[PDB]
């Protein structure tokens, strides 16, 4: 496997992050910073060609 | 050089030796051979999960089965491998038939598709009946 | 719909479908009928998958 789990439930999505409440409503979020890609610039480059 | 591929592409005064003179005279105290065992099956990769995705076609791959059904039956599943891997009749780690309610339990069955409708028939059959109903033949 | 037949069934369920090649009184009916009024439009959804 690799990606498989994301092709459920609408996958039209932009950035993915996990989270969780305590009890009082404290919903810690963590959002990994987007490092930027090698395959999708060059995707970009050779639609610019 | 010529490295095969697993998966389908496409269409597919010498020497006087003061150093060694080796007797083996040690044991393993834990053992090599018990880590080799228990380390394979550490290494062992994540068992996917196939279910609910689509396929090539685009058919969600996934059984006619109710979700919470299966993740009820699921856990009976690995309930009965743990059964197996333990060597005893009971799964004394079990992963059902505990005094926690799970009715909200839902898992990734092939009832649903990716918009949130039944699965009775595929996708590619009812658009192809979608299309079929626009023609026109020879006058 | 489920059932073995589902042609005609389009057709019969949504009349702004078809194209309204001649000046036939149906074909200037769904001339005259709008265009973005027909299929799903709202859903409810809850949780993913």
Same mark, same amino acid.
């Given at each position: 496997?690799?990606?498989?789990?994301?092709?459920?439930? &609408?996958?039209?999505?932009?950035?993915? #992050?996990?989270?969780?409440?305590?009890?009082?409503?404290?919903?810690?979020?963590?959002?990994?910073?987007?490092?930027?890609?090698?395959? #999708? &610039?060059?995707?970009?480059?050779? #639609?610019?060609? | 050089?010529?490295?095969?591929?697993?998966?389908? !592409?496409?269409?597919?005064?010498?020497?006087? *030796?003061?150093?060694?003179?080796?007797? =083996?005279?040690?044991? @393993?105290?834990?053992?090599?051979? %018990?880590?080799?065992?228990?380390?394979?099956?550490?290494?062992?990769?994540?068992?996917?999960?196939? *279910?609910?995705?689509?396929?090539?076609?685009?058919?969600?791959?996934? @059984?006619?089965?109710?979700?919470?059904? *299966?993740? /009820?039956?699921?856990?009976?599943?690995?309930?009965?491998?743990?059964?197996?891997? $333990? *060597?005893?009749?009971?799964?004394?780690? $079990?992963? %059902?038939?505990?005094?926690?309610?799970?009715?909200? =339990?839902?898992? /990734?069955? !092939?009832?649903?598709?990716?918009?949130? !409708?039944?699965?009775?028939?595929?996708?590619?059959? /009812?658009?192809?009946?979608? $299309? %079929? @109903?626009?023609? %026109?033949?020879?006058? | 719909?489920?059932?073995?037949?589902?042609?005609?069934?389009?057709?019969?369920?949504?009349?702004?479908?078809?194209?309204?090649?001649?000046?036939?009184?149906?074909?200037?009916?769904?001339?005259?009928?709008?265009?973005?009024?027909?299929?799903?439009?709202?859903?409810?959804?809850?949780?993913?998958?």
């Amino acid at each position: 496997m690799l990606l498989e789990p994301l092709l459920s439930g &609408d996958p039209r999505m932009t950035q993915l #992050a996990i989270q969780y409440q305590q009890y009082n409503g404290r919903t810690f979020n963590v959002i990994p910073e987007m490092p930027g890609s090698v395959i #999708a &610039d060059c995707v970009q480059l050779t #639609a610019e060609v | 050089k010529r490295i095969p591929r697993k998966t389908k !592409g496409k269409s597919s005064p010498a020497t006087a *030796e003061p150093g060694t003179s080796n007797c =083996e005279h040690y044991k @393993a105290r834990p053992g090599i051979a %018990s880590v080799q065992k228990a380390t394979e099956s550490a290494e062992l990769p994540m068992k996917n999960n196939d *279910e609910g995705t689509p396929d090539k076609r685009g058919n969600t791959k996934g @059984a006619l089965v109710n979700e919470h059904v *299966e993740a /009820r039956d699921e856990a009976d599943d690995a309930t009965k491998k743990q059964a197996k891997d $333990t *060597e005893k009749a009971k799964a004394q780690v $079990t992963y %059902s038939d505990t005094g926690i309610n799970n009715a909200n =339990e839902l898992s /990734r069955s !092939g009832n649903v598709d990716n918009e949130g !409708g039944s699965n009775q028939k595929p996708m590619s059959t /009812r658009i192809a009946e979608a $299309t %079929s @109903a626009i023609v %026109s033949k020879h006058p | 719909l489920p059932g073995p037949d589902a042609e005609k069934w389009y057709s019969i369920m949504y009349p702004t479908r078809m194209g309204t090649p001649n000046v036939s009184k149906i074909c200037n009916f769904v001339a005259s009928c709008v265009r973005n009024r027909v299929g799903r439009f709202d859903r409810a959804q809850m949780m993913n998958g």
